[PDB]
Amino acid sequence: SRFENKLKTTQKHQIVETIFSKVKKQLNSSYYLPARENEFASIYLSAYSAIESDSATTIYVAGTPGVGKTLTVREVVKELLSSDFLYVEINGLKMVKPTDCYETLWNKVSGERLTWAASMESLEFYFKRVPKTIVVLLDELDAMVTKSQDIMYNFFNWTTYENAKLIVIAVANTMDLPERQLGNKITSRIGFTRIMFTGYTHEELKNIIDLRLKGLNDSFFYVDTKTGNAILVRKVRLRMSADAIEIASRKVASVSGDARRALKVCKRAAEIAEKHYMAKHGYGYDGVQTVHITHVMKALNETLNSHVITFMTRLSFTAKLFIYALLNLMKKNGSQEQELGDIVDEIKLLIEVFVMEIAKTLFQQGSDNISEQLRIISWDFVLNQLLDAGILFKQTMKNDRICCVKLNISVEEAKRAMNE
Amino acid sequence: NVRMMLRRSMYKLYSAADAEEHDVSYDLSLVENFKRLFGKDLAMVFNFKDVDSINFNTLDNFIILLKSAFKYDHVKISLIFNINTNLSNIEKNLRQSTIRLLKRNYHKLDVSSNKGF
Amino acid sequence: DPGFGSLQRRLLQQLYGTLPTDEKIIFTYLQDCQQEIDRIIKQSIIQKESHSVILVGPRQSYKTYLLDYELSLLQQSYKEQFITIRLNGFIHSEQTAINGIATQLEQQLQKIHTISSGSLTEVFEKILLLLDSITKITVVFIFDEIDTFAGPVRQTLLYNLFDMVEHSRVPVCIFGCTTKLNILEYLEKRVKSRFSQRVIYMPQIQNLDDMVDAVRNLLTVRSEISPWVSQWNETLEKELSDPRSNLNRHIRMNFETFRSLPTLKNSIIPLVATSKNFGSLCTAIKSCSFLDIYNKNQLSNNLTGRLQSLSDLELAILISAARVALRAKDGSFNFNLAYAEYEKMIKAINSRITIKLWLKKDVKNVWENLVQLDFFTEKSAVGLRDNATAAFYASNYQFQGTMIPFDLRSYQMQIILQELRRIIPKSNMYYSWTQL
Amino acid sequence: NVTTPEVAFREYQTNCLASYISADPDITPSNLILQGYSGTGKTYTLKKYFNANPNLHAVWLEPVELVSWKPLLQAIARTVQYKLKTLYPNIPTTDYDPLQVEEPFLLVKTLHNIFVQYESLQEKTCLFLILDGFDSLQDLDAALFNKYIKLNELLPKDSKINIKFIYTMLETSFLQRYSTHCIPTVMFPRYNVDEVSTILVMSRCGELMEDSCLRKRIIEEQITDCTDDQFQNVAANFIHLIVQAFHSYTGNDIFALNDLIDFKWPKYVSRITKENIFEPLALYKSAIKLFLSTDDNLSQTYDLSIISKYLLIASYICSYLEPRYDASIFSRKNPRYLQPSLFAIERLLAIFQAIFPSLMKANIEVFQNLSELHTLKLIATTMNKNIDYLSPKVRWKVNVPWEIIKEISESVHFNISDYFSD
Amino acid sequence: MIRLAEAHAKMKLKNVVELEDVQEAVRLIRSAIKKSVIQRKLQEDLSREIMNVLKDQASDSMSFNELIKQINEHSQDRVESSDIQEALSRLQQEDKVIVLGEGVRRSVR
Ligand SMILES: Nc1ncnc2c1ncn2[C@@H]1O[C@H](COP(=O)(O)OP(=O)(O)OP(O)(O)=S)[C@@H](O)[C@H]1O
Ligand SMILES: Nc1ncnc2c1ncn2[C@@H]1O[C@H](COP(=O)(O)OP(=O)(O)OP(O)(O)=S)[C@@H](O)[C@H]1O
Ligand SMILES: Nc1ncnc2c1ncn2[C@@H]1O[C@H](COP(=O)(O)OP(=O)(O)OP(O)(O)=S)[C@@H](O)[C@H]1O
Ligand SMILES: [Mg+2]
Ligand SMILES: [Mg+2]
């Protein structure tokens, strides 16, 4: 509003719009929908009736994140501006305290700042007195349910008044939410509409990608060979191999069916070809191009593959000495949780069961003057280093002997990474 | 605790300080600036009413906090230990490093309603 | 000469990295990792990218050193082009960090050329509307310990900045730095779907040769300042090229236990400031005997020098204290069981031969230091709470162990009996009592 | 380059603190750990550096005279603007409220407000903050010490004045929680038996030759014109013997030696002669009585009445006794060391009616002395001290050791050692 | 064990007991009642130490028995020779040393 005038600055020194820059502009998650096409009507025809008849209803939609329920209901109200209402995005997680949404509503009727207490008095005074038109989105309803359900009873008791000019639209995480957190007295007020949103399917996941790739798929750029700048000296083209786009779809629809996850794995795979193109020619920052299948093979795996195995073999010696002692106790006792003094008891014993040049160094950094150490060198350090790494876990006790230690990653992969 | 034993006690003298004086923080900050906050110097006295019911490590940690006030030279401290009985019990409970702090100028005055009838 | 002292001026600030940003030296075993960071960060400002990342690696791993190095590398040429907002998860809670952002915003505006005023959620929707919305100012976020924001209960602040990736016309970039490795499972579902999933692991010194190559680039001065420099540079590598040299020998120890450069980097700072002439310094890195004294002092009072620095009685109490501790199943022991044991032990030295057996009323004064030398612990005593409100819940709780007297607080053991035999020399008379 | 001082036994440690501290901020490391137990003179050897270095500027804070972190932030912000007033008095200032801060954001919010008006200075000056006693803060936890480490980096790094820290703490188990931050540490060792005596003689000659208790005893006895060196010898003969007859009792302390001297000194003064000033060995043989006793304890026959005395003697019976055995062995038809068991009500009067000399039936005064004994904290509740009256589940227990029971048994002629049988 | 050592001396037609004969005897009583990371570290420091003592002198032409009597006599008792054989085979695979027969052990050029 105000400060966007101050967020603008002047000197913009000719940023290089490369080949893959114009992809990521439309591969931004912003800018009719193919997948939830008919269900857009099922909201809207449920909404169009109450709007043009001055009533008060409730609409309940659920689903996993990434399915458009943040998006679709925005497309409902957007066309409605063409044809009497006040649009508010009452987000649950964007409220600091749960009562703070009450302040917004009384702010968004006349423009007054009153307390959560004093708002809902005048809100209740609004909802049963006004002679005769308010659209409210109650997003992410896991946030506003937590304390004692006294907030959630209000947001549906206002719907019961026949003289209440309000239209509520609830969007939750799960359909189960008025059956495993709320009471039945709320569950009578929630209704039984319950519009379910499933995942996306992999065919439609192809049909959502090309909507971003509408005017740019297999099109042509105008490029100078000196700076790598592309314009919608050569006239090059860039093509997208649709089969790699398909194998992006057949995984994301399989695991999650998430519309952000499908776009972003294409977005991550796009910039892999960006740096390899910049590696071969070096246009910096101041015949026919493509994106291979081998890009989305890596980037999809790049969502999966770890490093704690590679972290463990790149740790210190006494780190790998520590874990090898720790699995030795877990196969000695079979109790998966060993006392800390017994580990210090073991690393002593695992010496005497090159080793002497180790055992000299393992308890003192040379130095005859200051040798004879009980516990090993930097034993507090590696145990602190294994703690904040998340591999280990150690309960809090002022005794430094009988404080228990519990593993936090799978002990077999600890056994397996130890073998290297 | 150590905390509210300090905080209520600084509050209790502070209103007693303004009433004779004719915003601030309730801790030892007032103790050094009492020469500047109220003009004349300070000699406080501590009527510990029922001393054997208190967890003594709180009392032992309390008196070390009062030991830090000994470097300002415009304040004088005096402690009154109203025990019920059993002085030998009291030298058992405290830390021995603080008994040597206590044993500088002690006075074992007896106050009993029944003293030789 | 001051030219030797001028070399001390150069070498010290090289060991701290406080040079001007043109000559800050990155070690070779991570040059790839800064460039992919650079490819992230410089196309976020210049090419107006809006993508996030999480830095992950252990402590003291140049992570905060890498990021402001990029900023200083971009502060020289892209001055007004961006502003930075830096948040620590340590210094900021969940709710004051909103006031942390808004107050750090407005002070940039006077540097680039009504926001913090209001309630905490009043200013919250303000920075929502100021961010979601010639060229546009880009904003770089610097987050230290982002894992503590990733708690179980609310996770609000993560959810807003990650949605600012999706919708805002203002180009942003988020930089999470942490050390909890599996950071991605710590997030819930609805926040991770906002996340662009790209994390980058920080490298470690994977070969012995790597940090040897690092310390060479660390200590060598390349710019001409002192007459001593050309002499000083060849003395460094001659110690480093020889695998039998002591500096090369002691670096191998640092590769073994720590395998972390700023630990070794710490050791050199007194070693190069303790010299007063040029020739003494060259002998110091030739001898490296100061590193022995240094590792002596770092070791001198953790547990062993605690034990060596006690008198005859303090040993004799503790030696008895473990011989009681071996008998019970949990190992706990009272003060009366110690004293009784102590007396019995005493009743053996005179009969086998003149040693002042002390009273009851005095051992308490010795017993006081032994518990605050941490050679004993209380039986069920959680020592340090993790955060503030868990410690405040332990302060109001009146305790029962003080309500039993001093001589019956069931003290347990920190240093076990069998380990005492290895440290106590046989010349001491109580050596027959270490073993049972 | 710096002007180092010189002290008695910190010859290595003076070098490192001269190493890790310079007036230049770039050479100065950010955070620092001075570690050692109480009894090493770290507050001594730190200030002893600072008096020899008037070029730098030190702001001295004291956590032990505070109680919490919320005033500790108020302690910092009040003092730097207090100090910078007394360092650059020409610089104008919008003085802020140090009472206003209570949260760790607000410090770096206010230090962003403080340092910006001081930007016009001529060179990068450092400013050393000193915290003394960080472990004995009485509301400490895990996530406070790291909270003060990163305070430097939240500051703007390009300001003309740079704030850096030095932390004084003890209890080296605490430092082992934070070794992974790898901040530079200078450990301070404990002492040995000679250097305790060597420190103590050069620190206590300035009072024990100038005390009036000597100066009275000078003119009271026939004063031979003994030298100050002759006063120095008897002082040195005192110190070299008092550490010899007490070192096993005190350990390697300095504070616990600094007061035991000031208890046994005038009692030593009275037992000197005119002649034993030249005769030190026989002087110890005449003043022997104090050198084998502690004299730190400033055994009561207890005040309580007769029926309350038998009320105590029945309460000690359930120390090692249990309800499975007591009703058999006390019919009308060893845990001397161990911690006491738990009572209930009316088991007292079960044993009290038995062991009293039908001769008694009225129990009003017997109920009187119970809560009399509760105020004496000799028998206390297991639970909180509130609802113990109405018989809910409340368990009771003694808190008196065996010897005071043993004297009070014979004080009422009652025999107790028969009924304790291992 | 002295009766065990004299029975070791009873076999193989010996009238005087020998120093090697008790070694096996003890192995006996230690076995009658009964690739690690520390073994990898042992092989690593043994490879580092053998590279330093094989490259410090000028005359690289030196066999295995002279190597055994020159690196184990300045310290205490015998380390496992099969681990030294495995370390030299590891260096054979990494082309650090060349075997070239049982009479001379030389490094790479
Ligand atoms: N059918 C679609 N057509 C075009 N763009 C889409 C479609 N579905 C999702 N998107 C895009 O992907 C983003 C995903 O956000 P949404 O799925 O609307 O949020 P969501 O499903 O509610 O997940 P939340 O908000 O965390 S519960 C949208 O903001 C759009 O930018
Ligand atoms: N102002 C600074 N200039 C240059 N180097 C610095 C500065 N502050 C810290 N360092 C270096 O930072 C390194 C420590 O790594 P850091 O990234 O700062 O800490 P980290 O553990 O890696 O991440 P943090 O700080 O714990 S969130 C050391 O090598 C320091 O020399
Ligand atoms: N080298 C020395 N020369 C002279 N006096 C010394 C020396 N070292 C220590 N002292 C004395 O030792 C005393 C101990 O002072 P402190 O600094 O309080 O001891 P401490 O170990 O710091 O315990 P604290 O106060 O709890 S940190 C000082 O007051 C000095 O008088
Ligand atoms: Mg909604
Ligand atoms: Mg001190």
Side-chain angles (χ1 to χ4, degrees), chain D residues 21 46-47 50-51 53-63 72-88 111 114-115 126-132 161-168:
Chain D
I21 288 174
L46 180 51
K47 174 60 93 190
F50 280 145
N51 312 133
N53 304 268
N55 39 2
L56 67 95
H57 300 291
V59 182
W60 276 64
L61 264 298
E62 201 60 41
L72 175 59
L73 280 84
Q74 290 167 335
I76 287 183
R78 75 175 70 252
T79 42
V80 278
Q81 61 193 347
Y82 182 43
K83 165 71 183 188
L84 291 187
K85 269 175 189 186
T86 76
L87 199 45
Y88 317 99
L111 275 193
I114 284 177
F115 272 14
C126 203
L127 185 56
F128 297 91
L129 197 56
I130 293 95
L131 297 204
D132 194 2
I161 294 95
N162 288 1
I163 169 171
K164 292 182 186 291
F165 287 77
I166 284 144
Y167 301 92
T168 289

Side-chain angles (χ1 to χ4, degrees), chain A residues 23-35 37-112 116-230:
Chain A
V23 164
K24 285 180 285 302
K25 284 210 58 51
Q26 268 91 35
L27 221 46
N28 204 316
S29 79
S30 44
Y31 197 80
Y32 186 79
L33 70 156
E37 207 274 336
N38 63 93
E39 276 90 356
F40 160 66
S42 161
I43 294 296
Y44 168 57
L45 275 297
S46 190
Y48 180 75
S49 81
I51 281 301
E52 313 290 335
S53 55
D54 307 332
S55 182
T57 78
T58 170
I59 288 95
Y60 184 74
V61 175
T64 174
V67 299
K69 53 202 179 315
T70 309
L71 176 59
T72 41
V73 305
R74 190 175 313 162
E75 312 311 300
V76 168
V77 57
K78 183 181 161 190
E79 50 87 16
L80 287 182
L81 270 295
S82 68
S83 299
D84 294 339
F85 43 86
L86 305 182
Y87 158 55
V88 296
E89 285 218 25
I90 314 300
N91 199 338
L93 282 180
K94 293 185 179 185
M95 281 324 114
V96 201
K97 208 64 204 303
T99 67
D100 303 354
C101 52
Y102 289 75
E103 270 87 353
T104 70
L105 269 71
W106 180 244
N107 192 209
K108 289 306 122 179
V109 286
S110 315
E112 288 181 30
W116 62 289
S119 53
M120 83 169 92
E121 290 317 288
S122 45
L123 280 178
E124 178 182 343
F125 186 76
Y126 190 91
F127 286 152
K128 58 210 304 173
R129 298 291 170 259
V130 178
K132 305 172 291 186
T133 85
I134 296 298
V135 47
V136 175
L137 288 75
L138 215 53
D139 296 15
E140 284 280 2
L141 205 63
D142 276 329
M144 285 174 304
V145 66
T146 310
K147 243 65 172 174
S148 83
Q149 306 90 52
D150 298 333
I151 175 171
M152 286 283 102
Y153 168 61
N154 264 271
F155 278 102
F156 301 144
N157 196 4
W158 296 323
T159 71
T160 81
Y161 287 164
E162 202 153 323
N163 254 305
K165 322 145 65 194
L166 62 90
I167 291 301
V168 300
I169 297 99
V171 175
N173 198 343
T174 314
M175 188 88 52
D176 216 331
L177 182 84
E179 296 94 332
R180 53 180 261 163
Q181 288 84 17
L182 277 303
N184 43 7
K185 48 198 306 158
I186 319 294
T187 316
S188 158
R189 281 182 194 82
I190 197 59
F192 209 72
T193 76
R194 308 188 179 270
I195 295 172
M196 179 43 172
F197 276 178
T198 170
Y200 274 7
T201 62
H202 78 285
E203 313 94 298
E204 305 215 278
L205 266 187
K206 307 185 300 171
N207 307 142
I208 195 176
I209 286 299
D210 43 2
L211 289 198
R212 313 295 177 85
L213 312 193
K214 270 171 81 153
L216 56 97
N217 194 13
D218 308 344
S219 314
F220 271 73
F221 279 154
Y222 317 137
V223 52
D224 55 328
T225 54
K226 296 146 290 301
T227 69
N229 187 44

Side-chain angles (χ1 to χ4, degrees), chain A residues 380-381 384-385 388 400, chain D residues 173 176-180:
Chain A
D380 70 323
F381 159 73
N384 196 289
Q385 195 180 359
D388 44 23
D400 293 327
Chain D
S173 90
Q176 284 154 20
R177 201 188 291 264
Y178 301 100
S179 78
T180 40

Side-chain angles (χ1 to χ4, degrees), chain D residues 353-388 391-393:
Chain D
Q353 172 54 230
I355 66 182
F356 210 84
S358 167
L359 196 147
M360 60 86 64
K361 185 64 176 176
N363 315 128
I364 173 65
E365 290 311 289
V366 193
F367 287 150
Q368 219 57 55
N369 293 326
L370 277 171
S371 78
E372 286 268 290
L373 262 292
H374 189 282
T375 313
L376 260 70
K377 302 310 286 183
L378 307 188
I379 40 170
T381 59
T382 42
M383 70 149 290
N384 202 355
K385 278 68 60 189
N386 302 323
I387 202 53
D388 319 278
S391 165
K393 295 180 182 297

Side-chain angles (χ1 to χ4, degrees), chain C residues 143-290:
Chain C
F143 272 38
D144 262 356
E145 273 74 18
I146 207 179
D147 54 332
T148 48
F149 278 170
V153 50
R154 302 300 301 118
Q155 300 183 357
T156 74
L157 179 49
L158 307 95
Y159 165 81
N160 320 128
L161 49 87
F162 274 133
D163 274 317
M164 278 318 194
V165 168
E166 303 301 86
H167 308 324
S168 174
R169 282 89 203 164
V170 186
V172 312
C173 66
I174 308 164
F175 276 80
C177 321
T178 172
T179 180
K180 269 290 156 189
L181 264 169
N182 41 7
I183 183 75
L184 304 173
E185 51 87 20
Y186 276 146
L187 305 181
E188 320 187 331
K189 204 264 165 173
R190 73 193 69 90
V191 287
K192 179 198 306 175
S193 177
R194 304 316 222 284
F195 184 45
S196 159
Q197 295 311 111
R198 176 198 204 158
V199 303
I200 186 167
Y201 299 98
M202 289 321 283
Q204 293 91 55
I205 296 95
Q206 60 269 69
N207 310 312
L208 164 67
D209 179 50
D210 311 338
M211 47 188 317
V212 171
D213 208 358
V215 65
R216 176 178 286 104
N217 282 319
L218 180 52
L219 270 295
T220 317
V221 52
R222 332 281 174 83
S223 315
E224 171 75 20
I225 292 95
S226 175
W228 303 117
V229 162
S230 176
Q231 182 48 244
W232 159 237
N233 272 346
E234 49 209 350
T235 46
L236 269 174
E237 50 88 20
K238 183 178 179 180
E239 300 310 291
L240 199 40
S241 63
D242 203 309
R244 331 182 48 82
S245 44
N246 281 331
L247 178 56
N248 210 297
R249 185 172 48 90
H250 282 227
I251 281 180
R252 186 153 293 105
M253 297 176 182
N254 191 92
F255 175 57
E256 285 307 304
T257 59
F258 298 100
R259 206 169 293 198
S260 54
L261 203 51
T263 47
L264 195 165
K265 187 207 313 158
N266 167 229
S267 279
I268 310 300
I269 317 163
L271 199 144
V272 303
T274 186
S275 169
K276 285 303 148 290
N277 78 95
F278 172 73
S280 62
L281 196 137
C282 312
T283 53
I285 70 159
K286 256 173 188 159
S287 69
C288 295
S289 158
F290 177 75

Side-chain angles (χ1 to χ4, degrees), chain C residues 59-65 144-145 265, chain D residues 150 157:
Chain C
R59 280 289 148 84
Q60 287 285 132
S61 299
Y62 308 96
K63 325 200 303 305
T64 73
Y65 166 67
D144 262 356
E145 273 74 18
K265 187 207 313 158
Chain D
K150 297 313 205 306
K157 214 163 296 309

